[PDB]
């Protein structure tokens, strides 16, 4: 029951996130899908892996919400991504923090999200479980990559779409320091924590080569 | 042509899709005019009572008094025992009680039968 509930939650919430226009709503649906993945991990009898994913998600999702809040405040309390255009150069620190957080969220290798999400996918691929739940989890991973792409493309890449009076500003030490601490965390904490904790479950040493790369392929 | 919108109780019809507003007759215009007239008279009365520097209290609303009185104290004098009221009262006030009685009586009979037969395994069940 836990596995099925988690799978349907992650698929449904990623599907909802795939087409939202409020930035906060997109990040909230991403949070819900990650929670569904955590419940899927619990269902396949891997509690320590779920706790590790909790720890990594904390870092990178909190940084993502801080970057969204920075954009919202700088654009005069505007939250719709239809009305934010070219911010890649207009505010570069939020851009780089958001890119790094999106890469960690999508399980880019050797980042904080790698050490949890990659192991989750490998564990669900090699267990006596539902086929439907496995397929839903894979589609959810693809949709995670897809909605991260949506956020970046509609918030940073195009031409500006905000009102003419430009009040863009990042130069506040409080914002920069608060974001950069969790940036360093979302780069290194996965490696540090994974190397520091004792082993709590049997590893998946030998897997088919196509099955080892499935998370990267779907992403 | 485009697929039609079907209104429901919890999703009503848009005002812009009402055929009634496209059938305009002088009587409809006069009705709208007198509706606005009574609305404006009420608004003028309220705004006269509202901007008064001398007033230092609550502006009593007869509409609110009528609403509360009709909801609370006007029910019984207008109640009439009919087949509909009798049947609905009997159902909504008796059915749940007997349904729940059957449920709990059956469950406790099964539990007591199991206890008497000795096959319940009440180990560690100290606090009751």
């Amino acid at each position: 029951m836990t596995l099925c509930l988690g799978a349907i939650t992650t698929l449904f919430t990623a599907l909802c996130a795939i087409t939202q226009n409020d930035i906060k709503k997109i990040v909230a649906f991403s949070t819900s899908s990650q929670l569904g993945l955590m419940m899927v991990t619990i269902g396949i009898n891997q509690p320590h892996l779920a706790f590790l994913h909790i720890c990594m998600h904390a870092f990178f999702k909190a940084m993502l919400f801080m970057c969204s809040g920075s954009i919202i405040h700088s654009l005069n309390d505007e939250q719709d991504i239809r009305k934010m255009g070219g911010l890649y150069k207009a505010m570069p620190f939020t851009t780089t923090a958001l890119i790094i957080g999106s890469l960690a969220l999508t399980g880019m290798p050797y980042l904080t999200g790698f050490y949890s999400k990659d192991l989750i996918i490998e564990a669900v691929n090699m267990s006596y479980t539902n086929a439907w739940a496995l397929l839903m989890t894979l589609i959810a991973t693809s949709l995670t990559a897809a909605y991260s792409t949506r956020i970046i493309f509609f918030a940073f890449l195009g031409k500006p779409r905000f009102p003419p009076l430009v009040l863009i500003n990042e130069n506040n030490p409080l914002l920069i320091n608060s974001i950069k601490r969790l940036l360093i965390g979302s780069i290194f904490a996965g490696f540090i924590i994974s190397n520091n904790i004792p082993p709590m479950t049997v590893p998946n040493t030998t897997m088919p080569l196509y099955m080892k790369m499935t998370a990267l392929i779907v992403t | 042509s485009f697929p039609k919108y079907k209104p429901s109780r919890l999703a009503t019809l848009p005002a812009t899709l009402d055929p009634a507003e496209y059938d305009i007759s002088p009587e409809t215009r006069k009705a709208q005019a007198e509706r606005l007239a009574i609305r404006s008279r009420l608004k003028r009365e309220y705004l006269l009572q509202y901007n008064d520097p001398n007033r230092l209290g609550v502006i009593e609303d007869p509409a609110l008094i009528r609403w509360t009185y009709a909801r609370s104290a006007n029910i019984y004098p207008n109640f009439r025992p009919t087949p509909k009221t009798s049947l609905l009262g009997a159902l909504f006030g008796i059915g749940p009680l007997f349904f729940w009685y059957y449920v709990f009586k059956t469950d406790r009979d099964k539990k007591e039968k199991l206890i008497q037969e000795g096959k319940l395994d009440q180990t560690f069940n100290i606090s009751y």
Binding site: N76, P163, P164, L167, N169 | -
Partner: protein
């Protein structure tokens, strides 16, 4: 927030700036008091487009009942100032 306290001069400057970018209007002809239908020879749909452009410029929207009776730049500026509580 960190939003500058906009003044009536700024509102008038921005309104005239938006109106001068409307190529249907000759920048020489129009003034603050220039009426839209008579002095400038504009249509009603042109007026609603002007109101939408003002809404986009200032980041807030004007209700249709109030918008439909804004016929001069001066009263547009006055409406914005009254809405934003800008005395000066």
């Amino acid at each position: 927030s960190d939003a500058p306290p906009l003044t009536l001069e700024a509102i008038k400057d921005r309104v005239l700036y938006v109106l001068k970018l409307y190529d249907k209007i000759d920048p020489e002809k129009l003034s603050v008091n220039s009426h839209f239908m008579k002095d400038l020879g504009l249509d009603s749909l042109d007026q609603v487009e002007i109101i939408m452009a003002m809404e986009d410029e200032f980041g807030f929207e004007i209700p249709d009942i109030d918008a439909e009776k804004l016929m001069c730049p001066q009263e547009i500026v006055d409406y914005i100032a009254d809405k934003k509580d800008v005395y000066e």
